[PDB]
Structure 1
Amino acid sequence: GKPSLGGPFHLEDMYGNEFTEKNLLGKFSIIYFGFSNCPDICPDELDKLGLWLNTLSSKYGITLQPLFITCDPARDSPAVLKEYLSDFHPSILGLTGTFDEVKNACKKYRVLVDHSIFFYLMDPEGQFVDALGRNYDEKTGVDKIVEHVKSYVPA
């Protein structure tokens, strides 16, 4: 029904560990594509995500796997992502890689500033279940995620 987003990808997290689509299995993940040198948009989105994560865990006991994937592999090295993310929620994990690896990941999710606007929610089976745009605020975004997590049932 929804666009066939997602698929195999191979990246590295900001600590150097391999991270592929296989790491999405067994949990609800929320992915955001952006870049450290993005003005306004990306900082604002990551701030909103931090609010969501804290509300989710404290009020509903829900823990997501938040991932920040860079679209600028030229400058966003693991060290740059670690420093950039130090100003945001600690659970957010930055992912990067070679131009080819990043290009593929972006292609799989059909994804610079004007288009770094959706959060992609992936279920425990690694399937795309919903995208949260800027029209979701600190409260309605949480409501939508809770709905998906609590109603989830495996294959």
Structure 2
Amino acid sequence: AIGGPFQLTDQNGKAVTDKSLKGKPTLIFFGYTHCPDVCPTSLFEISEVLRAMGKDADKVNAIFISVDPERDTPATMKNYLSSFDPHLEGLSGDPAEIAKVITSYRVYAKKVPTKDGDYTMDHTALIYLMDRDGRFVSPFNLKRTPEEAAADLKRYL
């Protein structure tokens, strides 16, 4: 089964587990705060879907899990997510827990050293849709208007 148990921390320091994602459909994106193009564009596109949901945005989970736990602490994630829709929840964790979640969600993440102790990460770019029971449905299509993506997500309410 794609996905597994976890215990992570949101950008406000609140504990978040797999069990707390149950009851709502869930979009998940794995990335990192120092990503130059893919992450801000993906998280912007998700943000527009959440805006197009209106009041229903509170009835889904939209989760950004960092694959760069050495840098993406709650405070870093909070400030990063400040630019994006406020419904996005950013999850940080102990390196052990992130490595576990990466394996159970079949994520690819690889550090790529640049220069002077800095680095980028190659990583999975797909958006995961999990149902309200936490069961993987499919990857989620963002190549369409925010309203079309919102209408699709609403079917999982």
Q: TM tier, shorter chain? A: 0.7 to 0.9
Runs of 4+ aligned residues of structure 1 deviating over 4 Å after TM superposition are: none
Match of 1:96 among 92, 99, 104: 92
Q: Where does residue 81 of structure 1 map in the other structure?
A: 77
Q: State how 1:59-74 maps to structure 2 within 5 Å.
A: 61=56, 63-74=59-70
Matched residue SS, 2:65: strand
Q: Write the letter of the residue equivalent to 1:137.
A: R
Counterpart Cα distance in 2 of 1:116 and 1:50? 19
Alpha-carbon offset, residue 142 of structure 1: 3.2
Q: Where does residue 18 of structure 1 map in the other structure?
A: 15
Alpha-carbon offset, residue 124 of structure 1: 1.4
Q: What's the C-alpha RMSD, in Å, of the aligned pairs?
A: 1.8
How many residues are paired up? 143
Q: State how 1:98-137 maps to structure 2 within 5 Å.
A: 98-111=94-107, 112=109, 114-132=122-140, 136-137=143-144
Q: State how 1:48-59 maps to structure 2 within 5 Å.
A: 48-57=45-54
Q: Percent identity?
A: 36
Q: Write the letter of the residue equivalent to 1:51.
A: E
Q: Where does residue 8 of structure 1 map in the other structure?
A: 5
Q: Write the letter of the residue equivalent to 1:80.
A: T
Counterpart Cα distance in 2 of 1:80 and 1:138? 30
Q: Where does residue 112 of structure 2 map in the other structure?
A: none
* Residue 40 of structure 2 is aligned to residue 43 of structure 1: yes
Alpha-carbon offset, residue 30 of structure 1: 0.9
